[PDB]
Structures are given as C-alpha cells and as structure tokens.
C-alpha cells in the first residue's frame, strides 16, 4: 500500500502519507482553544502522522468565522501548548495554519465594528453569505483597501504568529493563501485591481505572498514553513482568468525564495476543484484539466507536494503510486473517522459525516463523539 | 397530507400536488423522441398527476446538450404523439417545456458550426464547461448578439413550437426562462448590456420574455401556457444585482398579460437555490436559507394564479410548502429520476432510491433511465 510507506519530510520520519487537512470547526470558545480540540486532535493523531490544525487567527482583525482559535496572544499560546503536547504524546507532527480572512469578514467578527481589510474596496457579492454567531447568514460588508504601510503590518502579524506557534511547541506553520481569503484576494486578477506595485500584472499580484513567506522563513526557518494555495478555486468570488499561469507564477516565486534562502520549504499544499454531473438548479468543469493542472504545479515545484480536495482511499493511493503527490490530506472523511488512518489500512467501512455539525460550538456531538473501528 | 389534497389547475383536476420537474436526460437521439421516453414518462405518470417534459428544442440553433428532443418539425410531433397518448392513458396531465439555450452552446451543437445567439457578445467564462457529445467537456464559444428582427424570429420559433406541441396532443407548454439560458440572458443585468430597447432598465430586460409569453398565449391560449424563471440562480454566469427586484418585475408583466388577454396562465414555476454547510475546497455557493424562502413567498404573493416551487424540496419541505400556503404545486427533480413511483413513495413515506449522476445525460434507453425499481 503506497499510502503507508515511509516518507522523509525534511527532518521528520513520517510512518505514512495520510494527513489531517486544516478544517475550521468553530470549537475554540472566545477565540481561545479549548480542551475539546486537544481530544479532537489526539483521536486523529498517530505515530509518525502529520496533522494540520484549523485556520488560526494572526490578528484581532483576521476572523471570518465564529469562535476560531487565535495564536496572537500570550494566553492562546499556553492553551495551544497543552494541545501540542497531547498530540506529541502520540508521536505525531502537527503544524498550525495561519489564517487571515481578508474581506470575508463581518461587523460581528471585527473589533469595534471596524471594516474588514482587503486588497480593494470591492466586496463579496450577494451570491455568498457569511455564517453568523446566531446561526443565520449575513451580508459581506464593503472592505477597506490597505496601503503599503498597512501591508507591511499584516506581514508582521504573520511573523509574530509564527513565532508564537513555535513558542507553543508547534513543529511548523502553514500559510493559508487559498480559497479566496486575504492572500488569495491579492493573487486572483478577478479581485486584484490595484494600480501600485501590488497589482496590474502577474508578477505584482504575487508580491504579497512573497513578503508573507519571506518574513516567516526569516523568523522560524523555511523547514518549518508550509504554503497552501488554490489557483483553480473561485471561492468567495475569487476566479482567475488563467489559473495555470497564476499557479506557475506562485510556484516560481517559492522556488526563488528557496534558492535565495538556501533552504527547502516544508511542503507545498494545493487544493483542486472536483466536478460531478449537476442539474441546472444545483450549479461545472473539466476533471481532466484539473488533474493536469495539479501535475504541472507538482512538477514545477522543488520539494514535497501535498494534494487535497475530493480525495479518497483509492484516489489517494493512485496519486502516490503515480508520483502526482508525496502526501495526501483528507478533509470531511477525517471528521467522521477519528481512526481514518487505520480504517484505510484495513480497508474498513467509513462512517458518514454530518454537515450540520461541521460548525457549531459543541465540544462533544459532531466533534469527538464519532466512534473508532 | 396537504400534498395529496386535490388542486384545480385551470381546467385540470389534479389529484395530488407532486409534479414531475422538467429534466434533460439526453435520450432523444438526434433530437427525435424515442420510445424510451414514452417508457420513462409512463412509469412516472399517475392518475391526476401533472408531468413536465424535458427541455425541448424550438429551432436548429436552440441546441446546447446532446440528443435533446425537438418539436420544431412535424416528424418530431408524431413521435411526441405516441408518448403523450401513453401518458394520457394513465390519466395524467403533461406539458412540454420549450427550451432555447442561447449562448450556452458550442459549434458542435450548431448547424454549420455557427456561433450561438444571445443578447450580448460576452461568452460564458472559464468557470463553466459544456458537456461534449464524446463525454468530455469543452469551452463555451463567443456568442453573437441578435437584433430586433432576429428577436422576432426567435419569438416566431416559440410560437410555431407551441402550435406543434398542441398538435402532438400536449395539454400545454412551459416557457423555459431560467438557469442562464437565452431568456435569462436578457433578464439578468450581469449579462444584458444592450443599449437598445431590450437592455438597460428593468422594463427593457423583461421585454424579450414578455414577447415570447404573449406570442404563445395568442397562439394556443393563456390557459395552456406556463412560465419558469430563476431570478436567484447564478447558473452559467447569470446573476442579477437585485434578484428580488427582477422577479417582481417579471411577475408584474405576467399579471398585465393575463389582464390584457382576459385569462390566467397555467401557472408560475420558480426554482430556488438550496444551501448546506460546505467546506472551503468544495466552493459550493453558500447563501441565506431564510432569504431564498422569503423571496419565493414574495413572488407567490405578487403573482395572481398558480405557483409551482422547485429546488431541493423533500417530502417534509413539500408538505410544509403547501400547508403554509407558500405554493400550490411542488415539482421534484433528482428524486424523480431514481424513483419512478415517487408519488406513491411520498404518500407512504417510503424509502427513496438513490440517483446515479453518472447516468445523467447518458444515451442508453434503459440503463439509469427506466431501470430504477418500484416499491415491492
Ligand atoms: C468544515 C471544513 C472546514 C475547512 N476549513 C479550512 C480552512 O480553514 N482552511 C483551509 O485551507 N481549508 C479548509 N477546508 C478544506 C480542507 O482543507 C480540504 O481541502 C477539504 O476538506 C477537501 O478535502 P476532502 O475531499 O477530504 O473533504 C475545510 C474543509 C471543511 C469541510
Ligand atoms: C439532470 C437534470 C436535468 C435538468 N434539466 C432541466 C431542464 O431541462 N429544464 C429546467 O427548467 N430544469 C431542469 N432541471 C432542474 C429541475 O427541473 C429542478 O428544478 C431541480 O433539479 C430541482 O430538483 P430537486 O427537487 O430534486 O432538488 C434539471 C435537473 C437535473 C438534475
């Protein structure tokens, strides 16, 4: 079984290749990680396994979901340490994803009702709604375009959060630059319309993520830095006119950073869209084109590649066997299977997941109440 | 069970409110209605039930899917006749949906590889791909913007198709003005940008659908005409900056036509988006469940006549839609694909067979089309 072969991610000896994909679960009450998260990650922790935490706030103005954990305060560092130690007791490697939602925020999630920040003043259209603390869905407000100085401050927020993650005991961090969030709002030409060095061309649109990656590498080392992007996903009105060229531009920039710094990044993480036969009301793409895009980016990048999005046991085995990726991270499957690692090894049946309990703030039901084999 | 209380849709005494939603299935090989369609509809016809056929071509240009039936030729009329008689033999009411895809087509689907027609020259973006005859997915080409005289030609195609449907024995027709096709390409301000009397204001953007509905009303009577719209669905890059205003403006014209004609239309059919909790990678549209429900009732209250609701409805949702007064009839889609006796299953609260998306839009007359089992 290819998925259970030893792999060397730098200085880490992984026993298998299944990874817990970063998934927001909204269980960190008052933006503070709780004891529920520790048991949540321990259940999915295995000897030599690789885990990625949910999107974690880097600043008070980076939340777009209710009760998401932060790592930008001293108190949150202490709570994360008890979770990391619990995971490390199982002999697993865990990274913390740094997440800034950008314009995908709301007044209820911003301090003193401040306007969300983004690359431009264009908001998210009415096609998308934002989940509210009371369970309803609200309208995305108009963001405020940030200047050159404020951009350097957001990069500083990434640097400090990475330092806090290492202080919390994490083995590394993952930069969330996908799914139409703050970094992805600078990369996609459908959102980026600035007339300065951060927009107007393919090279300029990638300047924000380069400074984010360079600062965190300069703080904790490239070997403890991961990057996640998704040029083919138009979540929250983040379509690109040429996902192929945008992906290659990002991949080329990462290679330049590695050569300049003389070090290899931890990995590259890319999610892909997956399409099925939809009706007219449901509302979509070419699967072969998406598969080719993943192969092209993997070939261009120099280092470990991680694929995600719609992958299963059979799909993951083929990806590793054909060399399309080094690691596979699973999402919704890990929600319903705390022991998904051993279930894949034994080809055991997989428990179904409940979408109504992906979010919400119950420590037990839909979060850790699912049973093992 | 309010879904099984009788409802009087004009002259038709329907024994229940479970409606077969229109669904393209790609079994009418070379646009000719096959005998498989008659088997497909016979399994699903019920005494006092209302059926709506798949989208049907009105001209050689209206094609955007493989092997979709036409009703623009007399040969297709006689093939359609055998299907209608079989459906009528089981005491069911059947309407034929007239469908023009507009810019949602390809050269392979057009005569002589001609460019598809639309309200604008803007194509559908790369976010969507069109199913190909060989099973792959291609790109949407650049459409051709039509003029005033060509708009009247398309209206004439709707009228001739409406006459042929009645000639085939259909109890009526439904105008497909939804899901980002030709009529929706005139309605949505995210697509329509014409400077003439067909673009700009709400009045101009509703002008095209008004002509189509009025022409078929003047041909076969308003009592045999239905209209389907989707103001709140962004299928194929068809979004409006104010879907609720657009739906009300459309309803306003329908009411005016009924007063002018002196008779009511068969019904108003509306499809709503449906939302669940998705992940970030799935990129599925996430809106407000309450907002869509309030839009549907607002269209229902504004319109004077029968209202048919569709999109993500179940047995419980369908029951509550009728009970609350939010709709008179409920049309079901994907569930009707895998459950030929869906009306019986809803009555008894029986288990529902799962549907195979792979056999959607395939060409086999039996596999995934008429081989779904009945209740034992
Ligand atoms: C509930 C949920 C929350 C998620 N949150 C994030 C997130 O915060 N950041 C991110 O990069 N991806 C997020 N994802 C996407 C996952 O990382 C992963 O790509 C996705 O689950 C698709 O993989 P799958 O086919 O196994 O479900 C989330 C997915 C789900 C289902
Ligand atoms: C395979 C398939 C084909 C469809 N074809 C059409 C069509 O040709 N015209 C139309 O107006 N709606 C079409 N629809 C939409 C349905 O009529 C209906 O509005 C929608 O599927 C809601 O179905 P549900 O109640 O099962 O959720 C189609 C849906 C599916 C799944």
Q: Do B286 and A358 touch (CB under 8 A)?
A: no
CB proximity list for A162: less than 8 A, separation 6 or greater: A98, A173, A216, A219, A220, A225
**Are A325 and A304 in contact, with CB atoms under 8 Å apart?**
no
Q: Judge contact between B61 and B117, C-beta under 8 A.
A: yes
Phi, psi for B137 (deg, rounded to 5)? -125, 130
CA distances from B159 to B162, B163, B187, B218 (A): 5, 6, 20, 9
Minimal-distance CA residue to ligand 2 atom 3: B23
Any ligand 2 atom below 6 A from CB of B330:
no
Determine the Cα–Cα distance for residues A124 and A103; give it in Å rounded to an integer. Answer: 8
Domains, chain B, with CATH or none = 1-376 (3.20.20.70)
Q: What is the four-CA torsion angle of A364, A366, A368, A372, rounded to 10 degrees?
A: 140
Task: With beta carbons less than 8 A apart as the criterion, state whether B343 and B16 touch.
Answer: yes
B283 with A234: Cβ contact below 8 A: yes
Distance B175 CA to ligand 2 centre (A): 14
Choosing from A7, A40, A109, A181, the catalytic residue is A181
Among the listed residues B143, B161, B286, B140, the one whose alpha carbon sits nearest the alpha carbon of residue B212: B161
Beta carbons of B276 and A310 less than 8 Å apart: no
Structure tokens at B369: 């089309």
Is there an atom of ligand 2 within 6 Å of B312 CB?
yes
**Tokens found for residue B72:** 């623009």
Task: Of B217, B333, B181, B218, give the one whose Cα is nearest residue B272.
Answer: B333
Residues in chain B: 376
Burial degree of B50 (CB within 10 A; 0-12, 13-18, 19+): buried
Nearest of B202, B65, B195, B230 to residue B119 by alpha carbon: B195
Cα dihedral: A300, A303, A308, A312 (round 10)? 110
CB pair distance less than 8 Å for B235 and A129: no
In terms of Cβ atoms closer than 10 Å to its own Cβ (0-12, 13-18, 19+), residue A369 is exposed
Structure determined by: X-ray
**Which one of B3, B17, B20, B22 would you pick to mutate in the ligand 2 pocket, going by the greatest count of ligand atoms within 8 A of its CB?**
B22
* Spatial CA neighbour of A48 closest among A79, A80, A89, A91: A91
Give strand pairing partners of B358: none
Three-class SS state of B18: strand
Cβ neighbours of A215 (radius 10 Å): 19
Cβ proximity of A223 and A264 under 8 Å: yes
| Closest to B191 (Cα-Cα) out of B118, B250, B246, B285 | B118
Which residue in the set A129, A230, A277 is minimally distant from B286, CB to CB?
A129
Cβ proximity of A66 and B277 under 8 Å: no
Q: Vertex B205, ends B200 and B209: CA angle to 5°?
A: 165
Beta bridge partners, A339, equal: none
Q: Ligand 2 mean position to B45 CA, how many Å?
A: 17
The radius of gyration computed from the CA coordinates of chain B, to the nearest angstrom, equals 19
Name the residue of chain B whose CA is nearest to A356's CA: B277
CB A207 within 8 A of CB A199: no
Using DSSP bridges, classify how beta strands B12-14 and B7-9 pair: parallel, antiparallel or unpaired.
antiparallel
10 Å Cβ neighbour count for A299? Answer: 12
Q: What distance in Å separates the CA atoms of residue B93 and residue B254, rounded to the nearest whole number?
A: 23
Report d(CA A136, CA A147) in Å as an integer: 33
Contact between B199 and B193 under an 8 Å Cβ cutoff? The reply is yes
Asked if A97 and A53 count as a contact pair (C-beta separation under 8 A), the reply is yes
Sign of CA dihedral B341, B345, B350, B356: positive
Whether residue B181 lies in the annotated active site:
yes
Calpha distance A334→B335 (Å, rounded): 29
Q: In this structure, which residue's CA is closest to atom 23 in ligand 2? A: B333
Residues in contact with A266: Cβ distance below 8 Å, sequence separation at least 6, in sequence order:
A9, A10, A95, A172, A222, A223, A224, A225, A226, A304
- Asked whether residue B133 is marked as a ligand-binding residue, the answer is no
**Which of B39, B278, B366 lies closest to A356, judged by CA?**
B278
Disruptive mutation site among B122, B283, B335 for chain A (greatest number of A CBs within 10 Å): B283
Q: How many helices (H) and strands (E) does chain A have?
A: 11, 15
| CB contact at 8 A, B109 and B64 | yes
Angstrom distance (rounded) from CA B2 to CA A362: 37
User: What is the experimental resolution, given in Å to one decimal place?
Assistant: 2.2
Report the alpha-carbon distance of residue A13 to residue B310 in Å, rounded. Answer: 54
Q: Give the SS3 label for residue A82.
A: helix
Residue A151 has φ and ψ, to the nearest 5°, of: -65, -45
User: What is each CA distance from B171 to B58, B85, B90, B190, in whole angstroms?
Assistant: 17, 11, 14, 35
Q: Indicate the DSSP class of residue B3.
A: G
Query: What is the C-alpha separation between B161 and B59, in angstroms, rounded?
Result: 8
Cα distance between residue A305 and residue A297, in whole Å: 9
* φ/ψ of residue B112, rounded to 5: 55, 25
Is there a contact between B329 and B266 (Cβ–Cβ < 8 Å)? no
The four Cα atoms B314, B320, B325, B326 give a dihedral, to 10 degrees, of -40
Which of these, B287, B306, B211, lies nearest to B244 by C-alpha position? B287
Q: Element (H or E) spanning B254, and its range? A: helix B243-261
B247 is in an annotated binding site: no
User: Is B24 within any annotated ligand binding site?
Assistant: yes
Query: Which neighbouring-strand residues pair with A327?
Result: A306
Cα of A338 vs its chain's centroid, Å: 20
Please indicate whether residue B48, judged by its CB atom, sits closer than 6 Å to ligand 2: no
State in Å: Cα A218 to ligand 1 middle: 28
Structure tokens at B124: 């559908």
Query: Among residues A369, A367, A370, A371, which one has the least CA distance to residue A26?
Result: A367
Which residues sit directly before a break in chain B (C to N > 2.5 Å)?
A: none
Helix (H) or strand (E) holding B137: strand B137-138
Distance CA A266, CA A222 (A): 7
B237 CA distance to ligand 2 middle (Å): 18
Are B70 and B56 in contact, with CB atoms under 8 Å apart? yes
Give backbone dihedrals phi and psi of A223, rounded to 5 degrees, phi first. -65, -15
Angle, CA of A36, A38 and A42, to the nearest 5°: 120
- 3-class secondary structure per residue, B356-369: CHHHCCCCCCCCCC
Q: How many CB atoms lie within 10 A of CB B49?
A: 22
Rounded to an integer, what distance in angstroms lies between the CA atom of residue B355 and that of residue B142? 34
Dist CA A259 CA A251 (whole Å): 12
Residue of the nearest CA to atom 30 in ligand 2?
A279
Q: How many CA atoms lie within 13 A of A339 on its CB side?
A: 12
- Long-range residue pairs from A314-317, CB within 8 A, at least 24 positions apart, any chain: A316/A3, A316/A17, A316/A18, A316/A344, A317/A1, A317/A2, A317/A3
| Min distance A283 CA to chain B CA atoms (Å) | 6
Sequence-ordered list of residues with C-beta below 8 angstroms from that of A205, at least 6 positions apart, any chain: A186, A187, A188, A189, A192, A198, A199, A246, A249
For residues B122 and B119, what is the distance between their CA atoms, to the nearest angstrom?
A: 9
Name the one residue in this structure whose structure tokens are 């992007």.
Answer: A229
With a CB cutoff of 8 Å and minimum separation 6, the contacts of B153 are none
Q: Are A156 and A146 contacting, i.e. CB atoms less than 8 angstroms apart?
A: no
């Amino acid at each position: 079984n290819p998925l259970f072969s030893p792999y060397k991610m730098g200085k880490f000896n992984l026993s298998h290749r299944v990874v817990l994909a970063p998934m927001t679960r909204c269980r960190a009450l008052n933006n503070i990680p709780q004891a529920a998260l520790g048991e949540y990650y321990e259940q999915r922790a295995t000897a030599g396994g690789f885990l990625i935490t949910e999107g974690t706030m880097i600043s008070p103005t980076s939340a777009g979901f209710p009760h998401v954990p932060g790592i930008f305060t001293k108190e949150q560092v202490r709570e994360w340490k008890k979770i990391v130690d619990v995971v490390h007791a199982k002999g697993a490697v865990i990274f913390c994803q740094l997440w800034h939602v950008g314009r995908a925020s709301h007044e209820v999630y911003q301090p003193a009702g401040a306007a969300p920040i983004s690359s431009t003043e264009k908001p998210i259209s009415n096609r998308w709604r934002i989940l509210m603390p009371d369970g309803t869905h609200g309208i995305y407000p108009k963001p405020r375009a940030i200047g050159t100085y404020e951009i350097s401050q957001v990069v500083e927020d990434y640097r400090r959060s990475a330092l806090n993650a290492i202080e919390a005991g994490f083995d590394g961090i993952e930069i969330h630059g996908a799914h139409g969030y703050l970094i992805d709002q600078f990369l996609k030409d459908g959102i980026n319309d600035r007339t300065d060095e951060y927009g107007g061309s393919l090279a300029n649109r990638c300047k924000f993520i380069t400074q984010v990656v360079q600062a965190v590498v300069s703080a904790i080392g490239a070997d403890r830095v991961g990057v996640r992007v998704s040029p083919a996903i138009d979540h929250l009105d983040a379509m690109d006119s040429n996902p192929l060229s945008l992906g290659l531009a990002v991949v080329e920039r990462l290679n330049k950073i590695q050569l300049h710094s003389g070090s290899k990044l931890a990995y590259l993480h890319v999610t892909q869209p997956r399409y099925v036969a939809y009706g007219q009301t449901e509302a979509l793409g070419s699967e072969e084109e998406e598969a080719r895009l993943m192969r092209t980016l993997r070939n261009a990048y120099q280092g470990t590649f991680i694929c995600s999005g719609g992958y299963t046991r059979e799909l993951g085995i083929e990806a590793v066997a054909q060399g399309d990726a080094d690691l596979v991270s699973y999402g919704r499957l890990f929600i319903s299977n705390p022991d998904l690692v051993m279930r894949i090894k034994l080809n055991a049946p997989l428990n179904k997941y409940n979408r109504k309990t992906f979010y919400t703030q119950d420590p037990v039901v839909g979060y850790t109440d699912y049973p093992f084999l």
